[PDB]
């Protein structure tokens, strides 16, 4: 991909001029953001930037943009609404319910192909040639929005990268697009640094054997999910398994990298998984070593842990420096990682007996066996554990926490399937229209909410829609 970076920044300037019209008049800025790391960092960037301009703001951290949400926002008396890290897939609904309000969309998902009214400004790098999952995240769009508003907001560069890491925008091992420009801004201020290290969770707070056993993207053969074998392997290679990765010297890290690469080669791992095991890791000298805020992936996991318990507002406070909010949030990470471990064990046990395999898709309905906010991780795990054909997309459904008759689904696939022509966001958007649902997202990763009554109909429908995308 090749962005028109200046054309995108010109659009950012247009949105900044609009929001300053309302700041001048003392209008309270209504902010709607997503509950994962990309949305939480986005909300904190807006909260800090708008605080620097003396503006007032009201933040709501939500699970998605829905028609039910927009009907609630229609009755709110705010003059301007800012959607961050979401909203691109709901332009028609935003046009309908917020017609007489000013709306700013700071997002990176493929936008719905509809025209907007003059007071609804879409700020999306995809419209300027960006790859939606590599070149910039929602926190990155919000960062450049904040930077154009005030140059001092460059000190939010690390927070913006935390959201990009939460969105796995360095999933192939390196950063791309305007994420590299954010990194340069943070390096100029000395608030972040890019290392070439093991790209796994647990650099700061986990012992080495849990860092290896937790690895699911990519998995480490025979070691993933088995802390006892991880301990044996580390000791056999001359490492203290209880030591943390940050406590290793640079010489020991390189020795660990060599052993892991040899291990994956000996067990037949693919080249793409080997090449992304070691790569860009962003750390921040603003925080001490051993603190999860010191590394972007641990920081993002910490924020996701707060949003998992409907406490994303606590995660926003952590980004803004609330140390008491940090002390609470730190106690939420362990149960978050444990639930992912149990989710993988449930997948390995029940995939064969429960999965619905069509000609172009896997559809797995877990009921409540996996939390609805974890179906995206579950779908990726099925691919990364070898349960699913890499060229066949995986959709995992779970009952929503709020409505047992409503399902939340996440679709995930690989680059090999994208080469076949599959586009999960486009397919889910079309299928949702036919079963009274709401769906959309990236070509490689998308989500959908449908009534539980429509599950059997949806499986036949999405299999047909995906099959027609095949080039
Ligand atoms: Cl999703
Ligand atoms: Zn160019
Ligand atoms: Zn997303
Ligand atoms: Zn995002
Ligand atoms: Zn690149």
From TrEMBL:
Instruction: Mention one GO molecular function.
Output: metal ion binding
| Binding positions for Zn(2+) 4 per the UniProt entry | 176
Question: Where in this chain does the record put each DHHA1 domain?
Answer: 361-467
What positions does the domain DDH occupy? 29-157
Provide the binding site for CMP 2.
Answer: 216, 340, 412
Q: Which Gene3D superfamilies match?
A: 3.10.310.30, 3.90.1640.30
Q: Report residues binding Mg(2+).
A: 38, 85, 108, 167
**Pfam families the record matches:** DHH, DHH_CID, DHHA1
Sites where the protein binds Mn(2+): 38, 108, 167
Residue span(s) of domain DHH-CID = 200-278
According to UniProt, the name of this protein is Single-stranded DNA endonuclease
Q: Which organism is it from?
A: Pyrococcus furiosus (strain ATCC 43587 / DSM 3638 / JCM 8422 / Vc1)
What does the organism's lineage look like at the top? Archaea, Methanobacteriati, Methanobacteriota, Thermococci, Thermococcales
